[PDB]
Design a protein around this ligand. Structure first.
Ligand code: HEM
Ligand SMILES: O=C1N[C@@H](Cc2c[nH]c3ccccc23)C(=O)N[C@H]1Cc1c[nH]c2ccccc12
Ligand SMILES: O=C1N[C@@H](Cc2c[nH]c3ccccc23)C(=O)N2CCC[C@@H]12
Length: 396
């Protein structure tokens, strides 16, 4: 039909050209239709409109997550019979801050030592390898696996990590699996945490699941601990693995920038911020439901309708960023949207910045690292909410 269906099938790092077309049209908010459900939706692609949307308290994120809300995702992101309301459950139980406490600057100081040491250890192992090696399987996977165990879930086994990663990949998709496969992925993840969350939270370490289980308050429910574990998987696993893979690709495609960072390590934090702007992650959009009839940049939104913002489209808006499709670590542009904006700004932003910085520094210290094939030959997992290549073949 003549209404665009969403998402735009841009599973690689090449953003759908449709985002720039909509940005340049005469509509600040464009009506689209969810491919997976047929639900009507609104879509924002301009930075200035996105700021107005995401800072407006009359637009609710949680309302756009509830069962029956118009939605881009083909299946509800919750096991049948569960609330899928983890942040609110923690607030209700009195755990207003445990997320911020386990992911904020103090947590970063507790974890940044081993995170940087592991990034260096992993890269040093690759520096001893022959021929071609896979940065996805032999850098991103061990690093993100350590992150998830040590900061989020506890000492998982390899079978448990793979099960949870498979659940995330299967449920957090627009296509490439059946409806029942996706639902069962949320079911399997839920039943894993009903079975094992107490034990995982009891292992040594300072992981968030333990902090949540041991926090002050009645005591936290079994269902409640499962919701918390599910949240940490969906929010921290595919995001970290996808972003680190994508960031590595960006760096490999910009050897001049890497050479500069090798010569000027003090410039690495600015490079991290430019990676968060330039490197695309989600193939969908952040979204909010209007809690009352309202207007944004002249467009009337009725209560109950859901407005999406593509963070990728906003990060590539030439009204905000001069030469927005250039990777420019020295950029002094406005704040990027890689972590969102406003109330729901990524609570893990400090820890993510920590792991991205350790990755950038590991690459920058070792000149000669290159993609072993052309970027057009990288294979991408089709339909994931959070883009991720199947492998990153690399050489010295
Ligand atoms: C490079 C890595 C990451 C990126 C780019 C990223 C990005 C984002 C973005 C854009 C949002 C906003 C969603 C919205 O506005 O609706 C968000 C929310 C969130 N992030 Fe991150 N994230 C990353 C890693 C992590 C990690 C490691 C965790 C650890 C658990 C985490 C936890 C969360 C949570 C719980 C939320 C939901 C907050 C809410 O809805 O109020 N993120 N993230
Ligand atoms: O905390 C949230 N914020 C927003 C945006 C968001 C942040 N990170 C994401 C990763 C994937 C999709 C959306 C988000 C949301 O839409 N949903 C939950 C997470 C969630 C989704 N399905 C669940 C099942 C059980 C427990 C938690 C969740
Ligand atoms: O692809 C998605 N992204 C998040 C928001 C987001 C955008 N960029 C992000 C980056 C990290 C975490 C979340 C996001 C979201 O709300 N979704 C609902 C169904 C599709 C799914």
């Amino acid at each position: 039909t003549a209404t665009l269906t969403y998402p735009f099938h841009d599973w690689s790092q090449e953003l759908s050209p449709r985002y720039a077309q909509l940005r340049a049209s005469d509509a600040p908010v464009c009506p689209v239709v969810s491919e997976g459900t047929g639900d009507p939706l609104w879509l924002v692609t301009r930075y200035a409109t996105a700021v107005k949307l995401l800072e407006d308290s009359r637009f609710s994120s949680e309302a756009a997550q509830a069962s029956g809300a118009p939605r881009q995702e083909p299946v509800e992101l919750r096991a049948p019979g569960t609330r899928g309301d983890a942040i609110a459950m923690l607030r209700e139980a009195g755990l207003r801050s445990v997320l911020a406490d386990g992911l904020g600057p103090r947590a970063v100081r507790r974890h940044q030592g081993w995170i940087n040491d592991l990034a260096e250890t992993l890269m040093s192992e690759l520096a001893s390898r022959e021929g071609t090696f896979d940065l996805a399987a032999d850098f991103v996977e061990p690093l993100s696996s350590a992150l998830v165990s040590r900061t989020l879930l506890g000492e998982l086994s390899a079978d448990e990590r793979d099960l949870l990663a498979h659940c995330a990949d299967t449920g957090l998709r627009f296509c490439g699996v059946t409806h029942e496969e996706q639902v069962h992925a949320f079911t399997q993840m839920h039943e894993f945490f009903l079975e094992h969350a107490r034990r995982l939270a009891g292992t040594p370490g300072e992981h968030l699941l333990k902090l949540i289980a041991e926090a002050p308050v009645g005591p936290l429910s079994d269902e409640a601990l499962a919701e918390a574990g599910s949240l940490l998987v969906v929010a921290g696993f595919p995001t970290s693995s996808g972003f680190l893979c994508g960031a590595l690709l960006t760096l490999l495609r910009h050897p001049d920038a890497v050479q500069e960072l090798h010569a000027h390590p003090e410039r690495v934090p600015s490079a991290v911020e430019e990676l968060l702007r330039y490197t695309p992650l989600s193939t969908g959009s952040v979204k909010r439901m209007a809690t009352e009839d309202l207007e944004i940049d002249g467009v009337r939104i009725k209560a109950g309708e859901v407005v999406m913002v593509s963070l990728e489209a906003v990060n590539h808006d030439p009204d905000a960023f001069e030469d927005p499709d250039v990777f420019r670590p020295g950029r002094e542009g406005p704040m990027h949207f890689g972590f969102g904006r406003g109330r729901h700004f990524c609570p893990g932003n400090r820890l993510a910045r920590c792991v991205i910085e350790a990755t950038v520094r590991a690459v920058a210290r070792r000149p000669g690292l290159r993609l072993a094939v052309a970027p057009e030959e990288i294979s991408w997992h089709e339909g994931l909410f959070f883009r991720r290549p199947r492998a990153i073949p690399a050489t010295w």
